[PDB]
Symmetry: C3
Subunit: 183 residues, 3 copies
């Protein structure tokens, strides 16, 4: 079981603002002590489908959280739907929900849960993706590990942009990053 | 399969952008299961794109290098990259002849569909920035697109471009790493 | 044996300007002919701990060097301490110091040592990381392979920034890159 993923089709699997308003494509491949991750996002409807900052100046960011319990299982408060996340089988997923994926969780010593101790920035990775694949439409994808509550582990994607986009569909290029694995 | 498909890493020209063997593309593809970890750099040694001067030629701002593969993952002759040294790695060179299969290194067609009249999504593109001559003030964009060429089953296209006005700058780049979802 | 690392704790292991003034977290995971690297830096004391370019406009960069001999063993003149640079075991290291790691070394034909032959830029990788995890606090991390002398192989991290930061602690987000291995 070396890859946990959302199948790479275009069917909605994530709820940002309203039910199933987006397709998060996330592939986590275990390369031993590091997880190699590849991510992209297609928003298909709702509030974040077409960005028009002339009309809505305040719509400049949104968040997608993946919350996991002690066994690396996705919790239902996550934005990504549970039915859509599992180990890879061909171009699809296994038939039944996995029970353990601790080896794909962000390492708690590298990336500790919030506490009264000093918080370090190494639990964040920043990247830039491009809306519609156009070079002049960058948006930031900030990924943070284990900073959510109500979970043993978490991966949070905070998307934001600073440009004033007018009628730009929120569907992105892909970004790769890695993180240190719990086991 | 943790093998590596590569161009070998010396600097002998192995690619044709504007004229025969005018450049050396160094591309290393390593299979990490469902993802291919890729490392790429480029050295142009002659011809039109060797030395850039956007004051005399402001129109020269981009070029393309295409790798075309057949259904077996074999590089096709009409790719910009020459077939002679694109092969699986054996030490600092290649295995004795020519792989026949490398489908496991090809860009996934569900993730990155060939052109059609269905909506074209941006996820088949990865943008990166590399630097000419290793200088921090000489960025150029390397845009990599998967499976968008025709006359092939799979493809990897590198579109190089720059918006800075370069003056007699040699086009040889730093390296960029990206990954993509593997077909198998 | 597929991972050479600094361990993921925050105990200082690197000397930039003064003894153990920082924790360099570096994980090298061998993915065959390519090494997948993940790096971040936390400076805890000394000259590069708090950056203030109003006060010291001259402090705009520093370097961290890892020098290796023919066997891939870290030389003591590296900025990183030999103490906790070893193959991984859980969240720590193996008890005994390794004696060979040539397969983690940057390839000499791809990245040759300086000579009177033409020097090419492919032995460099540039990335951007963010101080304190703030998006408006970018710094460049430039990594160069095999350009140091007095070693068979080397990996050098050159950090620099161009913005005038005022009392910004140098602790970074993480960055991932890869390089061609010697064997
Ligand atoms: C693919 C990529 O790197 N996109 C860049 C983009 C392109 O370089 C540009 O659109 C190509 O012509 O530039 C972006 O920044 C614009 C910004 O760039 C600074 O260097 C410049 O000083 C500013 O005046 C301004 O041009 C863009 O938003 O278009 C960023 C994007 O990441
Ligand atoms: C390696 C890297 O990130 N290079 C940057 C480059 C360097 O940060 C900078 O040259 C180091 O001083 O900065 C580039 O953009 C520049 C801006 O940072 C600067 O404020 O204004 C410059 C124009 O006067 C320029 O836009 C650069 O030098 O081209 C971009 C490059 O990616
Ligand atoms: C995480 C990231 O990409 N950070 C960018 C940063 C952010 O996009 C921005 O601060 C929003 O948080 O933007 C940087 O570039 C700036 C431009 O976005 C801005 O328009 O002009 C600034 C100069 O006045 C600056 O060039 C930044 O804040 O430095 C670049 C950084 O990588
Ligand atoms: Zn629409
Ligand atoms: Zn030249
Ligand atoms: Zn501090």
């Amino acid at each position: 079981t070396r890859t946990l993923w959302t199948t790479p089709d275009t069917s909605p699997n994530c709820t940002i603002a309203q039910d199933k308003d987006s397709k998060l494509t996330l592939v986590l491949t275990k390369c031993g002590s590091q997880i190699l991750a590849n991510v992209s996002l297609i928003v298909v409807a709702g509030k974040y489908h077409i960005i028009n900052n002339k009309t809505n100046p305040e719509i400049k960011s949104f968040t997608i959280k993946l919350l996991f319990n002690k066994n690396g299982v996705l919790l239902d408060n996550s934005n990504l739907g549970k039915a859509y996340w599992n180990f890879r089988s061909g171009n699809s997923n296994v038939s039944t929900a996995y029970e353990k994926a601790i080896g794909f969780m962000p390492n708690l010593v590298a990336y500790p849960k919030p506490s009264n101790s000093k918080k370090y920035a190494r639990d964040i990775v920043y990247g830039t993706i491009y809306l519609g694949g156009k070079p002049d439409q960058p948006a930031v994808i900030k990924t943070t590990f284990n900073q959510e509550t109500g979970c043993e582990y978490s991966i949070t994607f905070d998307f934001s942009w600073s440009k004033t986009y007018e009628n730009v569909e929120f569907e992105t290029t892909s970004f790769t990053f890695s993180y240190i694995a719990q086991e």
